[PDB]
Amino acid sequence: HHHHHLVPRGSNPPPPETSNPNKPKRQTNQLQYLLRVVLKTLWKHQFAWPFQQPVDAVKLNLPDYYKIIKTPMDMGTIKKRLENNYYWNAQECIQDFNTMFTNCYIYNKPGDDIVLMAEALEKLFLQKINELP
C-alpha cells in the first residue's frame, strides 16, 4: 500500500479570541495601567519576542507544544485584548499573563533559555503589578 501518511499535515490551532461582542467589558484605571505600563514595558524587553505572538509550533518545530499546552496565551493576544477593551477587570488580564508564564514553566525545563526569559519577564511583571492603582 502506497499511502505513506505524509498528508494530512499538522497545523497550529486557531488563536485565542481578541474580540467577542457578547463578552462583558469595562474600562478601568487598573486596565489602562495594564496596557500603558505593564504590557508596554514587557513588550519592549529584549526577552519578549518568544511571547509576542501565539506559539507557531509549525515554524518552531515544536510538534508537541499544543499536545501539552491546552490553554495557550501570549502577549500579542493580551495586547490586542487590551487595545480592544476586551476585559471586564484587571484580574482577567492578569490571569492571561499568569497563564502565559505557567505554560512556559510547564513546557520547558528549568534553566532553559526560554525559562530564563520568562523568569525575567515575570519578575518585571510582578514589580509593575505591585504598583497597580
Ligand X SMILES: COc1cc2c(cc1NS(=O)(=O)c1cc(Br)ccc1OC)OC(C)(C)C(=O)N2
* Sole window of 12-20, 22-30, 31-39, 107-115 interacting with ligand X (rule: CB under 6 A): 107-115
How far, rounded to the nearest angstrom, does the alpha carbon of residue 111 sit from its chain's CA centroid?
Answer: 20
CB of 114 to ligand X, least distance (A): 4
Q: Is the peptide bond before 133 cis (omega within 30 degrees of 0)?
A: no
Burial class of residue 27 in the structure, from the number of CB atoms within 10 Å of its CB (0-12 exposed, 13-18 middle, 19+ buried): exposed
AA identity, residue 102: T
Nearer to ligand X, 6 or 106 (CB): 106
Nearer to ligand X, 58 or 60 (CB): 60
Which residue among 107, 120, 128, 129 contacts ligand X (CB under 6 A)? 107
* Length, in residues, of the chain: 133
Distances (CA, A) of 9 to 58, 91, 101: 10, 38, 29
Write out the binding residues for ligand X, residues 38-97 only, by CB under 6 A.
50, 55, 60, 62, 65
101 contributes a contact to ligand X by CB under 6 A: no
| Number of helical H runs and strand E runs in the chain | 6, 0
13 contributes a contact to ligand X by CB under 6 A: no
- How many residues line the site for ligand X (CB under 6 A)? 11
Q: Binding residues for ligand X, per CB under 6 A?
A: 50, 55, 60, 62, 65, 104, 107-108, 113-114, 117
